Design a protein around this ligand. Sequence first.
Ligand SMILES: Nc1ncnc2c1ncn2[C@@H]1O[C@H](COP(=O)(O)OP(=O)(O)O)[C@@H](O)[C@H]1O
Ligand SMILES: CN[C@@H]1[C@H](O)[C@H](NC)[C@H]2O[C@]3(O)[C@H](O[C@@H]2[C@H]1O)O[C@H](C)CC3(O)O
Ligand SMILES: [Mg+2]
Ligand code: NI
Length: 329
Amino acid sequence: QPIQAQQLIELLKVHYGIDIHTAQFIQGGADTNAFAYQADSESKSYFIKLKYGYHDEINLSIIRLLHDSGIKEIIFPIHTLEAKLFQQLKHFKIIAYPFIHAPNGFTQNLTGKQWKQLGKVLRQIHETSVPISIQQQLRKEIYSPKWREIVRSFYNQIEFDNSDDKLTAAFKSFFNQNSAAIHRLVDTSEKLSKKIQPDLDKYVLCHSDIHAGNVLVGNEESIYIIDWDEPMLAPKERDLMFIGGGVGNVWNKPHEIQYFYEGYGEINVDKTILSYYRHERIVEDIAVYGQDLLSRNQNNQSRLESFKYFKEMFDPNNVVEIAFATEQL
Ligand SMILES: Nc1ncnc2c1ncn2[C@@H]1O[C@H](COP(=O)(O)OP(=O)(O)O)[C@@H](O)[C@H]1O
Ligand SMILES: CN[C@@H]1[C@H](O)[C@H](NC)[C@H]2O[C@]3(O)[C@H](O[C@@H]2[C@H]1O)O[C@H](C)CC3(O)O
Ligand SMILES: [Mg+2]
Ligand code: NI
């Protein structure tokens, strides 16, 4: 909600030379730095992002590399009048894209054919060669204990309190009920991290967060991998962990996993790194949701979501049960 309709309209007119007659702010949003609007002209619809991050230029750098590489399953930004993929403004950055109406994977299942196409495209991304100038700017997999420590710092905080409101209490209670599994996730991630032999030579370009929510499933063959904010250099397992990973209660049907590899190309998958990620990723979520639900912070309009998502992870056939089900790797 930084600017208003008629304010974005002028900014798009001045910097993009586009004549928009209607623009609406969109809900959801990543949070903090991340606003999204739908702006329409007489003939087209645009999806506008007003970012406030730092890596936006290096990430645009990655889709620029992917577009050069011939990957069509990505939404290429719209050029500013200065031939740039983004317009640097006073306090924020503008990034326009054409508007894609397809629903994400949490709502639309992929057909066997689309599953093959996703495997084919992920392989393409992984096989993509990255210029050393970009590799030096991309974060690398260093198996940081950062999130495991934060979750542990929670261990000794889940105790009855009078200052906590209903939400905080319900969270501590839920935490206590699943304390065993929570420690197991942290311990298994820590354990597996030491069992892994870091071989920088086997690191490929990874999306790092390619679950169903980051896939727009259009008609057919018109699917799109979005959310290119965390690309990194790491083992391919960083991304393969999602196939059959169960994020969002989908992508948890074993028979689709084969459809996927049909296009990715059945190859050797390190079952240990693949298991590490499935555990570590949940540890990260526990840590992020945990901090939000404990800080108490009033401006936390997110606590509601954080709690819902937190518990969502422990549901039947969701990410926790799938990570624990080693026989699925
Ligand atoms: N080009 C686009 N056109 C239409 N909707 C889009 C477009 N890009 C993203 N979206 C919508 O926004 C949602 C979140 O996008 P994403 O890039 O993952 O942002 P965030 O990192 O905040 O989750 C997607 O589920 C989709 O509904
Ligand atoms: C910054 N990336 C996002 C964060 O990691 C976020 N957790 C703080 C993730 O939450 C999720 O893992 C998944 O993907 C979300 C990620 O895309 O998004 C779902 C809506 C909720 C989830 O629990 O299923
Ligand atoms: Mg997303
Ligand atoms: Ni193109």
